[PDB]
Amino acid sequence: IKIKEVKELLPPIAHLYELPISKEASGLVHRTRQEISDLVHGRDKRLLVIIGPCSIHDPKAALEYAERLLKLRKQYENELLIVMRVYFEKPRTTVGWKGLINDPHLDGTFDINFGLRQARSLLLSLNNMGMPASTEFLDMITPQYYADLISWGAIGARTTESQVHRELASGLSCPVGFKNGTDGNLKIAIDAIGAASHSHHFLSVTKAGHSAIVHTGGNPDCHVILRGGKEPNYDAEHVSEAAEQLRAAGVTDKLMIDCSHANSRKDYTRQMEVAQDIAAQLEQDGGNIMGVMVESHLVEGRQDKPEVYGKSITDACIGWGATEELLALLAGANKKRMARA
Template identity: 35%
Template sequence: MGYEFINKLPTPAEIKEQFPLPVECVAAKAQRDEEVKKAISGQSDKFLVIIGPCSADNEDSVLDYTSRLVKLQEDTKDKLILIPRIYTNKPRTTGDGYKGMLHQPDPEKRPSMADGLHAIRHLHMRVLMETGLSTADEMLYPDNVSYLDDIMSYIAVGARSVENQQHRLVSSGCHVPVGMKNPTSGDLSVMLNSVHAAQHGHEFIMRDWEVKTEGNPWTHTILRGAVSKHGQCLPNYHYEDLMLLHQLYMERNLVNPACIVDANHSNSNKQYKEQIRIVKEVLHSRRHSADLNSFIKGVMIESYIEEGNQKIGEHCYGKSITDPCLGWEDSERLIYEIAEGV
């Protein structure tokens, strides 16, 4: 076979033993899990705001950013649940470019998965320990979920992964809400099939074990826009798109109907400033329709300290090295406006 086996990586149990979560953090995370689940299930009318850098590329700046969310969470706690995006695995359309902290703890040095596993665990733990905010990350590699499952309160399955069998089956065993994005084609049935699969129990292979799951009732949808056969972005956050998805939900035997709207990616055509307008339109649609008010549970926003993005090696503190993000001032203002508009 054409593989060079470089390192035998530690198991999730070994990593957790090396970096155990403090007891007080276990309790804080459990409380946050329940709050997020209640928002998804409709037991709470709090609105989810999953917000943070496109990629968590630098521990210090990510901690700086997430520490700023603490005051905003306190100020809006009656209406919002803020979940920091700590995205340490990055899907790449062509396979080129920075693949996230898991691959490269230092974007300017060679890849090291062994170092990366330590780095992502350490970063997620620091966020929870220092801010009290449990985190969100993308399930890019299903086998890796167990390295962080005791820290995350939210998991996203990306547009390129949503049709994958293993992603769906592993999601069925997660104990926190998992959001299934629509595929890049925009086919809503693919996303809904993924939700159906994850909401039901399965038996399958995971990390050399035969495992059994009971299903994850908090699995839901994420609209992130689509791309046409001509390469044009097709947004799907408009009122008519939201109503269509709600209708399709009602035609299926799915529990806890719920949708999160991703304000960036193909919904904004990566025009990061448009996230502000898109979020406000989504809030307007919720106010206009009682069905959407109970169906749209939150938004995803890409945001960092400095707006825009930069190339690796430019060393601008708190600025994205992948997709462009909102800056802090716009983000802070938008969070307060969301709290007023829900």
């Protein structure tokens, strides 16, 4: 009774067969993961910029966004390592649309086989055009379908404390950022990095769709993300305090700052103020900052229904023009940080 239906799911290998990773995508992913690892461990001083839509609901608008962003990725490549946000899985406060995978037709039909196909296809097209991709890993089974095409992964604020999410991260091939908790707790993200760096044994699902025991090796390229709590936590004093806590736990004291969510108090117009503060830190010193996150789309704001093209149906985003402004600000500031060497 509590389970109304069990439905057919295609295993990852079906999608892999139709959409094998190309040589060029495979090289881009490999390189971008190493370049990000370098930032995490303080070997390079470019700023990782994870930027793009709160959520992907329309592949067409995503590829249009990617095309515009790719120009800026290239233009700023000596200062910034730009990776697009390509988020397919959304955690809700209670209920709501959980993302393109879970319900790609945006109407309660839950066509997950289509969703996974469409996700893999978009990620392959992105990597093929030269745009690497990032996503939040929320589900335990979906990652086998597309993790080979992801250069950087997030664990959400709502799952940073979760032991199964820490286990998942311990087996991912990409670097992973763990967000502080929804009321501001940083210690859980520091503890997550500790957990995810270790080997684990746990149950998962293979590429062929069958359950198995997996033994992971640990992920050495995890870091923390500052995304606000009851109050914002992006400023120099908060960064300095986090770095101190990170060092005391013996993990990397390089961290990423989210300009959106609780750092902008859920007002997309405040993302630019955050980025201005970060720019000012980078100009002064800013040695503990390795990255920033930005919720950005073609058109600003949000809507309940997907009426307007290139506008978020989840958290409100800045628009394109404001995106060019914010990237130019961050690239100018980091150029100065990098020259201080």
